[PDB]
Amino acid sequence: DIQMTQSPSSLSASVGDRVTITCRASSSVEFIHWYQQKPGKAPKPLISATSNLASGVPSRFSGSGSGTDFTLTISSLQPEDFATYYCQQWSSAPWTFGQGTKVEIKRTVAAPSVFIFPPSDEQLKSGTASVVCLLNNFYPREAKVQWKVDNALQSGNSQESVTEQDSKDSTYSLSSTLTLSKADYEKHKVYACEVTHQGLSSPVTKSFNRGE
Amino acid sequence: EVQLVQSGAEVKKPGASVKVSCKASGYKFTDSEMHWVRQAPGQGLEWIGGVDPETEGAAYNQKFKGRATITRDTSTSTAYLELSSLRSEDTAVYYCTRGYDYDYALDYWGQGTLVTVSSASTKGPSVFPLAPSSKSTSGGTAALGCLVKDYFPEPVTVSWNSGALTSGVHTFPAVLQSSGLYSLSSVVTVPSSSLGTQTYICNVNHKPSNTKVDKKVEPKS
């Protein structure tokens, strides 16, 4: 089978940059196709038969190459170009794809907007208390969330996840959930999430007092 | 407009079989091939095989070792992928995609179907509001959301106001809890000024447990 190897596997660039993604085939192919895929979305055709732009594809995209060496160029990177790009061949069975090249956007530092949510009364009725801390629209991705209950630093009772990069403003968002039993939740007063980030001069604390 | 609409996510036990459907519209179904490609994230994209709807001719990637069978119904413009002797490694998003011409890239792709292969028990989510309050405001904006807790397997989809609200929404990737169940949150930022006049409803769907929940999120009294 023909192995398709892309280089680099990931890159980060600024808006306006010229991006170069290579696709190498283990043996000669007649041409390649390129696809662009956004996270949790189906792939979309980008380039057909090495150099033909797919319908609706902006002119900033172009493809070149022959034999075993091909290149996808994005002439002036835009925030909506955040995606994984795949090359593909079907000159030889089985059809094979490249491993994908993830393109991420570099932008200015943006401080998170911090929001805190106490558990709902419906959840408390079930015997569980989840406290949610939201960090909205920040850059870079690196953020530190600390949970403090009655000013005591928490460990091993939270989980967090970050979104993929925003296609419009190139920021990230993060959600962290502190999960306690209702009995433990009822044992303390002050619930706080303390956020550290490059965009913040000092750590930001959002807190609430249980039953207020 | 060309549309390829697939069947919903499913969970299957190891050794079982799954049949995914792909309903085509907006073009002459018999004039183009229908292919199936899977994606196990992050192990990339793999072609499974395809069918010519006119002739019933099918070709497969040898790797599937005859476990995949691709068929179609020309009277309903639907293609099918059946994968047998399921193994844990078959957990992936399965896409149907149109092969329009040899010189053209696969041009229209279905939304994908996540098939999870597991012996574990399917569990429907509990949906809780993340009410907007004085603790979730930021310079005239308010954040609110829904917490979708304790479900299995993935995926849960979340829309707001039946798809009418999309700006400022963040539906986070799920986290895997110690129990092996998943949890996720979906939030939105809106004007704090109209919390009294606007209605915000999160629509949660977990196809494997046939769960559909619409939860109105109101400001915290």
Author numbering:
A (entry chain L): 1 to 212
B (entry chain H): 1 to 221
From the primary publication:
The trimeric serine protease HTRA1 is a genetic risk factor associated with geographic atrophy (GA), a currently untreatable form of age-related macular degeneration. Here, we describe the allosteric inhibition mechanism of HTRA1 by a clinical Fab fragment, currently being evaluated for GA treatment. Using cryo-EM, X-ray crystallography and biochemical assays we identify the exposed LoopA of HTRA1 as the sole Fab epitope, which is approximately 30 Å away from the active site. The cryo-EM structure of the HTRA1:Fab complex in combination with molecular dynamics simulations revealed that Fab binding to LoopA locks HTRA1 in a non-competent conformational state, incapable of supporting catalysis.
In addition, we determined a crystal structure of apo Fab15H6.v4 to a resolution of 1.8 Å, which we fitted into the cryo-EM maps. Compared to our solved apo-Fab structure, LoopA binding only slightly reoriented CDR2, while the other CDRs and the overall architecture remained unchanged. For all experiments described in this study, we used Fab15H6.v4, which differs from the clinical Fab15H6.v4.D221 by four additional residues at the C-terminus, which were removed in the clinical version to eliminate potential immunogenicity. The LoopA epitope within HTRA1PD is positively charged and interacts with the negatively charged paratope of Fab15H6.v4.
